[PDB]
C-alpha cells in the first residue's frame, strides 16, 4: 500500500512510521514545510502508526532528541514515540478490509488528516488547536498536549482495570476532535476501508 505523508505545517516535522517492533519503510524522515514523503507499507501490516515529531535534532549517525514523539532517540523510528503524539493508526488486509483511525489516547502534538487516496471510505481529521487550548495539567513542558493517562498514570485515565469512563480531560480531546479516539474506551471512530487501499497522512491539513 502506498502512503503519502505530507507536512503542510509552517514548522519542520520529523515524520515517523512504525508497527511497534520495526520501522515501516525507512521509519522516519525530516519534512521541512511543504515537503512530502511517500512510503510503501507492506500488505498485512497490523498495528501500524504514523506520527509527527517536533523540535528534533540528530547527528550524522541518526541519533538525537525530539521534544514530541521521540522514538528511542532515532531518526529512523523502529518503535513507537513518546507522548504527546497525534496518531494515524492502521491495520491493513485484515480479513479483506483495512481499518484506519486517528487517536488522541497518547496526546496531541500536530494537527492531522488521514484519508484514503483510493475510493470507497471516508477520511478522518483532527485539526483543532488542541495545543493552544490544552488544559494546564496536560501541557507538556516540551510542547504539545499530553493525554491524562501519561500525566496521572492511574486506571481512571488509563483504562487498565474495571471500566473507565470519560473524564474532563478525555472530553476536552473529544469536543475539539469528535472523529478521533479520546480514551481507550471511547465509542470507536475507526473507519473500515476496502482492503489494499492507499492513503495520505497530512500534517496541518488545509482548512
Curated annotation (Swiss-Prot):
As for subcellular location, the record says: Cytoplasmic vesicle
**Taxonomic classification, please?**
Eukaryota, Viridiplantae, Streptophyta, Embryophyta, Tracheophyta
CDD domains per record = TLP-P (cd09217)
Where primarily located? Answer: cytoplasm
* Keywords, in A-Z order: Cytoplasmic vesicle, Disulfide bond, Signal, Taste-modifying protein
Entry coiled-coil feature ranges: none
Q: What does this protein do?
A: Taste-modifying protein; intensely sweet-tasting. It is 100000 times sweeter than sucrose on a molar basis.
- Pfam families to which the protein is assigned, alphabetical: Thaumatin
Domain of life of the organism encoding this protein: Eukaryota
Q: What is this protein's name?
A: Thaumatin I
Q: Which SMART domains match?
A: THN
Instruction: Name the GO cellular-component terms.
Output: cytoplasmic vesicle
Presence of the UniProt keyword Cell membrane in the record: no
Question: What family is it from?
Answer: Belongs to the thaumatin family.
The keyword Cell inner membrane is assigned to this record: no
Species of origin reads Thaumatococcus daniellii
Disulfide-bonded cysteines: 9-204, 56-66, 71-77, 121-193, 126-177, 134-145, 149-158, 159-164
